[PDB]
Amino acid sequence: TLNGGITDMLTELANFEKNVSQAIHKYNAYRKAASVIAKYPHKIKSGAEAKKLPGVGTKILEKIDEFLATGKLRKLEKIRQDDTSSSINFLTRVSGIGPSAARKFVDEGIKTLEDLRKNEDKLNHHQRIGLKYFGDFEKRIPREEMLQMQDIVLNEVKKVDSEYIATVCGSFRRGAESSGDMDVLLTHPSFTSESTKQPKLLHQVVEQLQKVHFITDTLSKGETKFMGVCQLPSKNDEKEYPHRRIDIRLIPKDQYYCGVLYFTGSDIFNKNMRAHALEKGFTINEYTIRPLGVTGVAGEPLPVDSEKDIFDYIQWKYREPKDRSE
DNA sequence: CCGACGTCGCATCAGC
DNA sequence: GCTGATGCGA
DNA sequence: GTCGG
Ligand SMILES: Nc1ccn([C@H]2C[C@H](O)[C@@H](COP(=O)(O)OP(=O)(O)[C@H](Cl)P(=O)(O)O)O2)c(=O)n1
Ligand SMILES: Nc1ccn([C@H]2C[C@H](O)[C@@H](COP(=O)(O)O)O2)c(=O)n1
Ligand SMILES: [Cl-]
Ligand SMILES: [Mg+2]
Ligand SMILES: [Mg+2]
Ligand code: NA
Ligand code: NA
Ligand code: NA
């Protein structure tokens, strides 16, 4: 794209601040700046031009000037050369290893892929599966594969109970030609904001997907959120498909629109929209939009009958899913 | 200047 | 066991 | 790191 060099630089800085510095707000600031520059429809000529965008300030403007003049950023060149930062950044690429566990592993001399495989007994379950599928989980999913996966999930869910509705969200719902994983929103009329009239609603679906060998591993699992591993079936003599991350979120059926707004994302779009809600005097989660009293405490849920109702409350024009890929 | 920055599910741990 | 952080993830 | 009161 037009400003790929700048946005990659800001993303690398974002990852440093999260993984090494453990500075969650600097991480989000860099990602917000990279996102707003990514959708800017001109090739940026100067830091000053970029600083006009919301989320770009004086410091990123200076870095943009350095990068435009030299093609690189000295601050990043040094980070790339630091072994502890290098080790930490690698270890956090394993699902289940975060900034804290990464730094503890390096303290103990566990810093490479051979180190990890040599010490499986020092990994919790999630980390163990992330290491197992380390290569697969960095591969992207062609939309064609997402379509075959959607068909399995939708048909298997239908076999459990035809009253389930499963909706693939994430980047797939935003129309992306490839996705990092599969996100499935799930509803069933027995689970509403007012009652749960049937247990094991999420479990039953997971069990059925395991029994047809679509779901292969479990990272975490509770009553409303499954986080796991899935894999398409391959034909005779075919090489196997890579294993894929899958997330399944069971949402109260009457709160579907807030739930599908949340799970469609992107993450940055949700942050921006929820931040706008707060400025407008509302708070949004995956269940409800509520007003804020002068108090500061959230009031009662407002009526929502479409995704667009949520946008209307905060005085945003509606944005189709394909336009939320911030 | 400086407080706020989105919001929450599940796993793990510490204190009682 | 419970409860309230903290980690890591969506 | 950036924003807004
Ligand atoms: N920090 C986050 C992460 C995710 N989310 C929401 C929004 C996101 O679209 C949805 C699924 O999480 P993913 O990490 O899979 O994001 P996607 O938008 O699907 C990525 Cl573009 P992907 O295609 O690489 O998976 O969960 C969020 O609200 N906050
Ligand atoms: N997973 C889903 C998807 C849609 N729905 C409901 C919400 C609306 O009444 C309707 C939306 O239909 P559609 O968005 O496919 O046009 O179906 C649901 O209850 N659970
Ligand atoms: Cl709520
Ligand atoms: Mg996804
Ligand atoms: Mg603010
Ligand atoms: Na700006
Ligand atoms: Na990780
Ligand atoms: Na996901």
Among all protein residues, pick the one whose CA is nearest to the C1' atom of D5.
A279
Secondary structure class of A259 (helix, strand, coil): helix
Does residue A40's CB lie within 6 angstroms of at least one atom of ligand 1? no
Asked if strand C contacts A102 at the CB level, meaning under 7 A, the answer is: yes
Number of domains in chain A: 4
Q: What is the dihedral of CA A275, A277, A279, A283, to 10 degrees?
A: -90
What's the Å distance between residue A248 CA and nucleotide B15 C1'?
Answer: 34
Domain that holds residue A228: 140-262
Beta-carbon-side half-sphere exposure of residue A106 (alpha carbons within 13 Å): 18
State how far the Cα of A133 lies from the Cα of A311, in Å rounded to an integer.
39
Instruction: Report whether the peptide linkage leading into residue A266 is cis, meaning its omega lies within 30 degrees of zero.
Output: yes
A185 Cα–ligand 2 center, Å: 10
My answer on whether A173 and A223 are in the same domain is yes
Evaluate: CB of A255 within 6 angstroms of ligand 2: no
Task: Specify the ligand 1 atom closest to the Cα of A170.
Answer: 19
Q: Are A252 and A189 in contact (CB under 8 A)?
A: no
Whichever domain contains A60, its CATH number is: 1.10.150.110
- Structure-determination approach: X-ray
CA of A56 to C1' of D3 (A): 10
Any atom of ligand 1 within 6 Å of the Cβ of A326:
no
Instruction: Name the domain boundary from A262, A288, A308.
Output: A262
Question: Both A198 and A293 in a single domain?
Answer: no
